[PDB]
């Protein structure tokens, strides 16, 4: 029984531009076994309909997931990717940075 | 896609 | 080269119900098909545009494979849990990995059919297609019965037949996109961490395929020891993006140049930073 | 290989006032300065956006030499019209380009000073970069001077050295997108002229840099003999949109296929229509 | 004295939606001499701030102008380049066709 | 950018 945690990143499909519509992604990748939990928040609270990718694994048979959804960037809303795995014993919350 | 044929044992 | 792969990954919920089985097709780095046996009508669907022409006897065939392939992990996993003497309520994964890759004449490179059990390598074929790789004692076993069974033949057969002629189809199918590169939209970004030393982020956005090769080449041609590289990742549209960053002192950026290596670019990227 | 370019032309306007001279400066397609006479002040000006880095020596330099070519133009302009014959009233364009283009070490390949005369070809340096080809006999009298003064050497000098080397010093700057590729993006578009036949159009859209090949090729013929294909035309963007199209009989529409060769796709692309 | 006609071809920047803001494209290339006159129509009367590229020529010493506005497709209304020349008897009006 | 140096004529 391996365990890996899951590496986060946090990043948008396209440079962010405030009041420009655009993806925000929380990639996990990297993590064993495949249950994980993925959130996307807005100002602390939960934005509905993310969709993420079909579930896959690299060449370590490590997971890959992409969670998605279509945000408008600005200046005052702060967005950030909740994740929980059997490797973390409290979730773990990545905010977005736009130069990351 | 292909199924596979024996099992692992 | 061109690749065609299938990643299949069967789960079980002792308690809540029979494993979960879910397989993924890619071409290249883009994604056609998938198959997930918790969804609401399981069967062989396609996530690329071009797979939308199909006819009908293609999904029907694709979508028996895959339900006779689920009953094959639901019988494997089993068997596995029994082996080790495992606890029947644990929950266990069975991965498998399989497909072929075509080089320049669009004739087969190699061929892959590996298994993995809770993660770690179980059994694999070897790249002659004759031969498997066992990474236990219990794979030892396993590769001991497929090799009197004949099971390499079977899957040599696929690898160098249905999987080459599948491949070198969807290829013809989706030409005017998967052929496509996208050469990366790379930048230098300067953050200065301290009044020290200054952090330099090389960017490459929205690139396909996947693979690229970021190197930060400090004074002369010397590569660098100490770099953060993040893992590719995909846009969500279809492209990647990846970054390297390396950490320099204040008044030292015209030493470093960032180096981007893709499909797209007939030359290699040479990035400076000038504030 | 990659190529710096400028484009000189002086058109008399005998009554209105004096010549207007206009030099725009292209690197490989994409083009980064300008002098046009007719401007409020007449200077060089940066036409890309990695050329505002550049300092006022280098746009002092450059446009004392764009004002030193205006009286050259001038003094052509009426030493061909006199020779010529040509009425004085009647306005005449001179026309000129040279630049140099490197190969994959990025040393030279071949250099260019090339005149046009009202449109037609007048003088031209050839490949040595040491004699003359004379078009009329008005250039053979050019040429003769040419030979004797030697002006090849005068010109070969700056070809040789500072056309290349600022061709890689630009290719410093602009670099990042400079050196990218944007692979077309293909389409074929089916829109049935008759009630006998359809024209099928095959797209590339977006594409950098300009050369490209669209051929639509029936049966394996290479190309088509009733073919229409227009010229390669500015997006604006710049990238580059052309397509091709063909006449076909109803129902035969899928033997033809359409071929895309672009500097960004290490494999042509094959275009089908799919109704 | 080489004199030729120009080559005009009337498109926009990326494919045409309704209701979607694009640009509009009058290419002129192929003529001699440099002097033209092109004009960007809007069911037939004239846009205004209509820019132009920096006059250059291809290889065979023909000039060629890219002249361009931003325009918003939809189907009553018709978009059309009007081109003058020495070697045009009258203005040269080339309707804007979609598939073209 | 290379001035012209002898005119045509």
């Known amino acids: 029984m391996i365990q890996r945690t899951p590496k986060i990143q946090v990043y948008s499909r396209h440079p962010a531009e405030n009041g420009k519509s655009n993806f925000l992604n929380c990639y996990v990748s990297g993590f064993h076994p495949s249950d994980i939990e993925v959130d996307l928040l807005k100002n602390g609270e939960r934005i509905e309909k993310v969709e993420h990718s079909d579930l896959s694994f690299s060449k370590d048979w490590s997971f890959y997931l992409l969670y998605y959804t279509e945000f408008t960037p600005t200046e005052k809303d702060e967005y950030a990717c909740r994740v929980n795995h059997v490797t973390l014993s409290q979730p773990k919350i990545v905010k977005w940075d736009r130069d990351m | 896609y292909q199924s596979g044929l024996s099992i692992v044992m | ?275």
């Open chain 3, 1 to 275: 080269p061109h690749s065609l792969r299938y990643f299949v990954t069967a789960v079980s919920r002792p308690g809540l119900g029979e494993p979960r089985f879910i397989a993924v097709g890619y071409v290249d780095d883009t994604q056609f098909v998938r198959f997930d046996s918790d969804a609401d009508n399981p069967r062989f669907e396609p996530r690329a545009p071009w797979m939308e022409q199909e006819g009908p006897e293609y999904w029907e065939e694709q979508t028996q494979r895959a339900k006779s392939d689920e009953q094959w992990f639901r019988v494997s996993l089993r068997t596995a849990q029994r082996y080790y003497n495992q606890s029947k309520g644990g929950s266990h994964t069975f991965q498998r990995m399989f497909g072929c890759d075509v080089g320049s004449d669009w004739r087969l490179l190699r061929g892959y059919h590996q298994f993995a059990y809770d993660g770690r390598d179980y059994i694999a074929l070897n790249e002659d297609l004759k031969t498997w790789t066992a990474a236990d004692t219990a794979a030892l076993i396993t590769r001991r019965k497929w090799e009197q069974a004949g099971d390499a033949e079977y899957y040599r057969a696929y690898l160098e037949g249905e999987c080459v002629e599948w491949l070198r189809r969807y290829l013809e199918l989706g030409n005017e996109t998967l052929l496509r590169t996208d050469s990366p939209k790379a930048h230098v970004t300067y953050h200065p961490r301290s009044q020290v030393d200054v952090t330099l982020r090389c960017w490459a956005l929205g690139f396909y395929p996947a693979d690229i090769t970021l190197t930060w080449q400090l004074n002369g041609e010397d590569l660098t020891q100490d770099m953060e590289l993040v893992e590719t990742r995909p846009a969500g549209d279809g492209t990647f993006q990846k970054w390297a960053a390396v950490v320099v002192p204040l008044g030292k950026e015209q030493n470093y140049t960032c180096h981007v290596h893709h499909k797209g670019l007939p030359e290699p990227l040479t990035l400076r930073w000038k504030p």
